[PDB]
Design a protein around this motif. Structure first.
Motif, PDB file in Angstrom:
ATOM      1  N   UNK A 282       0.830  -1.199   0.000  1.00 43.47           N
ATOM      2  CA  UNK A 282       0.000   0.000   0.000  1.00 43.47           C
ATOM      3  C   UNK A 282       0.867   1.253   0.000  1.00 43.47           C
TER       4      UNK A 282
ATOM      5  N   UNK B  22       2.663   2.737  -3.394  1.00 46.36           N
ATOM      6  CA  UNK B  22       1.591   2.947  -4.358  1.00 46.36           C
ATOM      7  C   UNK B  22       0.730   4.143  -3.970  1.00 46.36           C
ATOM      8  N   UNK B  23       0.407   4.271  -2.681  1.00 45.19           N
ATOM      9  CA  UNK B  23      -0.316   5.449  -2.213  1.00 45.19           C
ATOM     10  C   UNK B  23       0.560   6.695  -2.263  1.00 45.19           C
TER      11      UNK B  23
ATOM     12  N   UNK C  86       0.480   8.650  -5.219  1.00 45.19           N
ATOM     13  CA  UNK C  86      -0.851   9.177  -5.515  1.00 45.19           C
ATOM     14  C   UNK C  86      -0.791  10.615  -6.009  1.00 45.19           C
ATOM     15  N   UNK C  87      -0.015  11.468  -5.345  1.00 41.93           N
ATOM     16  CA  UNK C  87       0.077  12.858  -5.773  1.00 41.93           C
ATOM     17  C   UNK C  87       1.266  13.560  -5.135  1.00 41.93           C
TER      18      UNK C  87
ATOM     19  N   UNK D 233       2.431  16.652  -6.952  1.00 36.62           N
ATOM     20  CA  UNK D 233       2.571  17.749  -7.902  1.00 36.62           C
ATOM     21  C   UNK D 233       1.932  19.052  -7.430  1.00 36.62           C
ATOM     22  N   UNK D 234       1.586  19.162  -6.147  1.00 39.46           N
ATOM     23  CA  UNK D 234       1.034  20.410  -5.628  1.00 39.46           C
ATOM     24  C   UNK D 234       2.019  21.558  -5.810  1.00 39.46           C
TER      25      UNK D 234
ATOM     26  N   UNK E  56       3.484  22.316  -8.573  1.00 38.85           N
ATOM     27  CA  UNK E  56       3.065  22.976  -9.803  1.00 38.85           C
ATOM     28  C   UNK E  56       1.878  23.894  -9.548  1.00 38.85           C
ATOM     29  N   UNK E  57       0.908  23.415  -8.766  1.00 32.56           N
ATOM     30  CA  UNK E  57      -0.275  24.215  -8.474  1.00 32.56           C
ATOM     31  C   UNK E  57       0.119  25.497  -7.760  1.00 32.56           C
TER      32      UNK E  57
ATOM     33  N   UNK F 162       2.066  27.955 -10.211  1.00 32.85           N
ATOM     34  CA  UNK F 162       1.156  28.650 -11.105  1.00 32.85           C
ATOM     35  C   UNK F 162       0.175  29.545 -10.359  1.00 32.85           C
ATOM     36  N   UNK F 163      -0.138  29.236  -9.099  1.00 30.13           N
ATOM     37  CA  UNK F 163      -0.952  30.147  -8.303  1.00 30.13           C
ATOM     38  C   UNK F 163      -0.230  31.468  -8.090  1.00 30.13           C
TER      39      UNK F 163
ATOM     40  N   UNK G  27       2.054  32.584 -10.105  1.00 30.42           N
ATOM     41  CA  UNK G  27       2.036  33.175 -11.439  1.00 30.42           C
ATOM     42  C   UNK G  27       0.716  33.888 -11.709  1.00 30.42           C
ATOM     43  N   UNK G  28      -0.375  33.378 -11.136  1.00 26.42           N
ATOM     44  CA  UNK G  28      -1.687  33.992 -11.332  1.00 26.42           C
ATOM     45  C   UNK G  28      -1.681  35.420 -10.808  1.00 26.42           C
TER      46      UNK G  28
ATOM     47  N   UNK H 217       0.468  37.720 -12.983  1.00 26.44           N
ATOM     48  CA  UNK H 217      -0.271  38.230 -14.129  1.00 26.44           C
ATOM     49  C   UNK H 217      -1.345  39.231 -13.738  1.00 26.44           C
TER      50      UNK H 217
ATOM     51  N   UNK I 141      -6.319  -1.247  -1.058  1.00 26.03           N
ATOM     52  CA  UNK I 141      -5.427  -0.496  -1.936  1.00 26.03           C
ATOM     53  C   UNK I 141      -6.178  -0.001  -3.159  1.00 26.03           C
TER      54      UNK I 141
ATOM     55  N   UNK J   7      -4.768   3.988  -4.270  1.00 31.89           N
ATOM     56  CA  UNK J   7      -3.973   4.552  -5.357  1.00 31.89           C
ATOM     57  C   UNK J   7      -4.773   5.525  -6.214  1.00 31.89           C
TER      58      UNK J   7
ATOM     59  N   UNK K 126      -4.927  10.054  -7.857  1.00 26.99           N
ATOM     60  CA  UNK K 126      -4.186  10.851  -8.827  1.00 26.99           C
ATOM     61  C   UNK K 126      -5.247  11.661  -9.557  1.00 26.99           C
TER      62      UNK K 126
ATOM     63  N   UNK L 254      -6.862  17.387  -7.783  1.00 21.46           N
ATOM     64  CA  UNK L 254      -5.766  18.345  -7.673  1.00 21.46           C
ATOM     65  C   UNK L 254      -5.167  18.641  -9.045  1.00 21.46           C
TER      66      UNK L 254
ATOM     67  N   UNK M 225      -4.993  22.126 -11.086  1.00 19.49           N
ATOM     68  CA  UNK M 225      -3.779  22.663 -11.687  1.00 19.49           C
ATOM     69  C   UNK M 225      -3.955  22.941 -13.173  1.00 19.49           C
TER      70      UNK M 225
ATOM     71  N   UNK N  52      -6.581  26.264 -13.231  1.00 23.35           N
ATOM     72  CA  UNK N  52      -5.862  27.457 -12.809  1.00 23.35           C
ATOM     73  C   UNK N  52      -4.772  27.812 -13.811  1.00 23.35           C
TER      74      UNK N  52
ATOM     75  N   UNK O  54      -4.347  31.336 -15.637  1.00 23.45           N
ATOM     76  CA  UNK O  54      -3.061  31.959 -15.928  1.00 23.45           C
ATOM     77  C   UNK O  54      -2.992  32.408 -17.378  1.00 23.45           C
TER      78      UNK O  54
END
Lengths: 50, 48, 830
Positions: A7, A10-11, A14-15, A17-18, A20-21, A24-25, A27-28, A31, B25, B29, B32, B35, B39, B42, B46
């Motif tokens: 688990x 793999x979990x 899951x994410x 990439x905040x 990037x958010x 770009x926030x 960047x908002x 602009x 599980x 998983x 993804x 969020x 992105x 938003x 931009x």
């Protein structure tokens, strides 16, 4: 035990990439401020015209 | 016979959590998710 | 292993030991089992109740965490014993035995005369039998046994004769004392098999039973060497009412089971006639084989595990019982017809071989393919097993191939290799002898070779570190890889980040354990567990030291800090007990005490001699650091756990007498065994000498210096007046003025006392308690201070770790690899 532990990674994938958010926030607002700056740069020229 | 009896359930059951952990599980998983939609949208904001 | 500490916590939650209900419930919550499934719920409850009763020695119905840990320790030592019983080591190919004589023809048969040691090989189509050594394949004589091809060559001990049967219808018994044919006997028929049967009963004469093509066992008394009777066989001429007993094909083999007085004959018809050798009549006919049975062995490992093992045209071996007619067991995995089945005497090991060089070694207690052997033989003609002093398999093929058992080469040694280190896993109640190949664990009570953790790492095991709980062995390899292996069975449960491809000079396990204090007062959103921060500090042949985090699952991210503290390889790392400061030493002569949590370095002030620091250890619990250099110097420094400079105190000239020249030269201390119980220092000498210093005087002086500093601090604090403070701050504007205060001096009081640490500490402050001269054959690689028993096991290049008893320091033990515990001089009783 194997399936109690598969688990994890793999979990974790899951994410992640905040970043990037958030970038770009920022960047908002970048602009947005550019919007007002160039608005003023337009308006001052508008007035001088007349 | 009694030892084989005390070991048949040991041969069978833990398959229960073998399936349970994978099934848990299954939805784990999954996230993804939105969020990334945020992105993307938003990012559109931009753009404009 | 992840929930070990959680189970410990829940068990301690009871405070008086977990009774049956809480005991079972805690293991049910923690176990990786199905709590909701009634089947395994109840089965695990029953198993844990059995465990509870077993742990119940006081009989009060309470199993303390102490008892549970002791049981886990016993199971860990048993796992150390890496068989769980009767280690069946794999048959390795004999690196020392191979065919030597020029066999002009293919090997037909090989009968190993254990009594004579005459491994008589009957060559195919060769009129001479070449008797080699079953231990070296050394042919004694190439003597013409007969006139034609020889089928069998059996030893008749009753007349010291080697009987050879030939297709020429002759049997030649040769006096083994001279290999001359004592007696030649003619027979009406050729006997394909010829076995000397010496039945157990004293009154039954020894019969050489010869099974020829007629299926009739011709019985030759070993004295007169002549036929006197014929056993039942397929004889169509004798057409009468006699029941069909025997075989319809030529006798392939004759197996005298002297224990059961049974002549076993296996025929091409798939029958195995058990003939009552007392009467030679059929007691039984084992059946179930698909084709002709050719080889039979009698696995007599235990009376309750007795099994006849039959092989032949069938590609699998059938297990048979004298009572139970049905084949007991069938050894699988064989790809081709099995040449035969061997049951090694004195071991549970049964070897079954296919025609394609594939051998399976099975444990009769389970009849499982414990070992697999791929003999480098295109074709294998036969095999003979030598059990005299060595378990060897001699494969008769295009060459005499030999495979040997993996017994320890030097049993008395703690290892066949350097006994690098000694670990006193007081929890395990055992001594773990670290050696280059593996970290060997030894029962402290018995000194037995408990665990040989071979393959613990991709490289040789040079360091073995006991866990803070003494439940995990940290192993670092010369490749730079660190890992945690369960000390139970040598499994590498976890690994850490690799070094820069450099051998880990030293490994330490510093666990910042958070004290249990009740907290009152707080309003914040922070739910962080009070995890015990365990870090493995590893130093290699590099300026960098890795601080791996055991709590960190990732081996690479384990290295909480890659800290550069020395200009060269870190010779040794010593964790100061009850502190976060660890002292690292290097050959450059500089010692750096770094705080693991803060990663701050405090360099010991340069000694009078920057000799290469060989062994660095804190005089725990004293604030004293001892460094043994390559030039026989043991420097003692007043190391302060705070920011106060670790102050050098003394330098004792460590002197051990040379064994040969009798000259006391400067010998670097290979190991420092700080027995805190004796305040004593076991200095290891390359002559294997366990020198022994008394550190009582130095430790007392350092403690009294601590007390003087504390008293000075208290006296200074006692004279503090009271002052008021300004209000509201603000307006900043801090200026710089450095030099306007460089002209204020001329007031000194009590300044020259604390600076005389070098002479305040004198070599007399470090007494020399003893010297186990010649304590080891070579340099003592380690000295483990088994403090609880006033014990210390010294490791050295002698490949031995001798037990040396602090009361006398005498070698009260020496962990001996061989299971010969009587020779294992382990007087330890726990």
């Amino acid at each position: 035990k194997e399936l109690k532990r598969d688990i994890g990674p793999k979990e974790e994938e899951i994410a992640k990439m905040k970043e990037q958010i958030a970038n770009m926030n920022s960047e908002i607002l970048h602009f947005k401020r550019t919007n007002a700056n160039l608005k003023l740069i337009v308006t001052d020229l508008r007035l001088r015209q007349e | 016979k009694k030892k084989a009896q005390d070991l048949e359930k040991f041969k069978f059951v833990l398959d229960h959590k073998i399936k349970e952990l994978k099934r848990d599980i299954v939805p784990r998983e999954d996230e993804i998710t939105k969020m990334k939609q945020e992105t993307n949208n938003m990012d559109q904001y931009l753009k404009e | 292993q992840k929930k070990m500490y959680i189970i410990e916590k829940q068990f301690d939650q009871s405070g008086k030991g977990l009774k049956i209900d809480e005991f079972v419930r805690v293991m049910l919550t923690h176990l990786d089992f199905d709590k909701s499934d009634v089947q395994k719920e109840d089965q695990i409850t029953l198993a844990l109740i059995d465990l509870f009763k077993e742990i119940d020695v006081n009989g009060d119905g309470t199993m303390e965490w102490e008892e549970f840990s002791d049981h886990i320790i016993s199971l860990g030592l048993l796992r150390n014993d890496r068989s769980f019983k009767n280690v069946i080591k794999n048959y390795f190919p004999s690196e020392h035995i191979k065919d030597n004589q020029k066999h002009e023809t293919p090997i037909e048969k090989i009968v190993y005369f254990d009594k004579l040691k005459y491994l008589v090989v009957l060559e195919k189509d060769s009129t001479r039998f070449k008797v080699y050594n079953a231990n070296t394949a050394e042919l004694y004589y190439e003597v013409n046994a007969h006139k034609c091809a020889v089928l069998d060559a059996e030893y008749i001990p009753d007349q010291n004769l080697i009987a050879t049967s030939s297709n020429d219808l002759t049997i030649n018994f040769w006096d083994s004392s001279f290999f001359i044919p004592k007696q030649i006997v003619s027979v009406p028929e050729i006997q394909l098999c010829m076995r000397y049967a010496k039945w157990s009963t004293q009154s039954q004469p020894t019969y050489l039973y010869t099974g020829g093509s007629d299926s009739i066992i011709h019985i030759y008394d070993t004295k007169t060497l002549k036929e006197k009777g014929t056993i039942g066989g397929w004889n169509p001429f004798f057409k009468r009412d006699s029941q069909q007993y025997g075989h319809a094909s030529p006798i392939g083999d004759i197996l005298p089971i002297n224990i059961q007085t049974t002549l076993v004959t296996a025929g091409l018809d798939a029958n195995i006639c058990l003939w009552d050798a007392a009467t030679h009549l059929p007691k039984k006919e084992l059946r179930g084989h698909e084709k002709g049975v050719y080889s039979l062995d009698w696995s007599d490992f235990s009376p309750m595990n007795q099994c006849l093992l039959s092989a032949g045209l069938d590609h699998e071996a059938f297990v048979w019982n004298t009572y139970v007619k049905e084949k007991i067991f069938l050894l699988r995995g064989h790809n081709h017809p099995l040449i035969g089945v061997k049951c090694l005497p004195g071991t549970p090991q049964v070897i079954t071989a296919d025609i394609n060089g594939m051998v399976k070694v099975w444990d009769v207690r389970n009849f499982l393919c414990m070992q697999t052997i791929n003999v480098p033989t295109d074709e294998l003609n036969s095999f003979v097993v030598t059990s005299n002093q060595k378990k060897r398999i001699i494969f008769g093929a295009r060459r005499l191939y030999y495979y040997e058992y993996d017994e320890p080469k030097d049993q008395m040694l703690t290892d066949e290799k350097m006994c690098l280190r000694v670990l006193y896993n007081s929890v395990l109640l055992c001594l773990i002898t670290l050696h280059p190949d593996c970290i060997k664990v030894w029962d402290i009570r018995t000194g037995k070779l408990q665990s040989v953790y071979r393959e613990l790492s991709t490289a040789e095991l040079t360091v073995c570190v006991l866990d803070t709980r003494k439940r995990k062995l940290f192993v670092g390899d010369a490749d730079g890889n660190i890992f945690t292996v369960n000390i139970k069975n040598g499994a590498k449960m976890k690994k850490f980040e690799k070094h820069n491809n450099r051998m880990i000079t030293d490994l330490t396990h510093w666990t910042s354990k958070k004290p249990a204090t009740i907290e009152i007062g707080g309003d914040d959103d922070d739910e962080d567990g009070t995890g015990d921060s365990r870090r493995v500090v590893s130093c290699s042949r590099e300026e960098t030291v890795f601080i791996h985090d055991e709590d960190s699952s990732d081996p690479s991210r384990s290295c909480r800090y890659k800290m550069k503290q020395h200009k060269s390889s870190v010779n040794s790392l010593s964790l100061k007990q009850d502190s976060e400061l660890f002292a690292s030493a290097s050959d450059d002569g500089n010692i750096v005490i770094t705080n693991l949590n803060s990663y701050r370095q405090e360099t010991l002030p340069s000694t009078q001699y920057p000799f290469e620091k060989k062994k660095v250890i804190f005089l725990d619990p004293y604030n004293a650091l001892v460094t043994s250099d390559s030039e026989g110097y043991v420097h003692f420094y007043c190391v302060n756990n705070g920011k106060a400079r670790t102050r050098y105190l003394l330098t004792k000239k460590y002197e051990t007498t040379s064994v040969v020249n009798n000259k006391v030269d400067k010998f670097p201390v290979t190991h420092l065994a700080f027995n805190s119980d004796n305040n004593m220092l076991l200095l290891s000498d390359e002559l294997g000498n366990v020198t022994i210093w008394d550190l009582t005087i130095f430790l007392k002086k350092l403690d009294e210096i601590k007390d003087d500093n504390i008293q000075q601090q208290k006296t200074k604090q006692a004279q503090t007046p009271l002052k008021q403070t300004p209000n509201r701050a603000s307006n900043g504007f801090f200026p710089t003025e450095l030099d306007e205060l460089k002209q204020i001096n001329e007031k000194q009081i009590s300044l020259s006392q604390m600076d005389n640490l070098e002479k305040y500490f004198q070599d007399k402050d470090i007494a020399f308690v003893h010297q186990l001269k010649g304590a080891h054959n070579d340099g003592i690689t380690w000295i483990e201070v088994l403090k609880e028993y006033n014990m210390f096991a010294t490791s050295s290049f002698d490949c031995c770790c001798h037990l040396w008893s602090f009361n006398d320091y005498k070698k009260m033990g020496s962990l001996i690899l061989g299971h010969d515990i009587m020779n294992n001089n382990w007087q330890l009783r726990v």
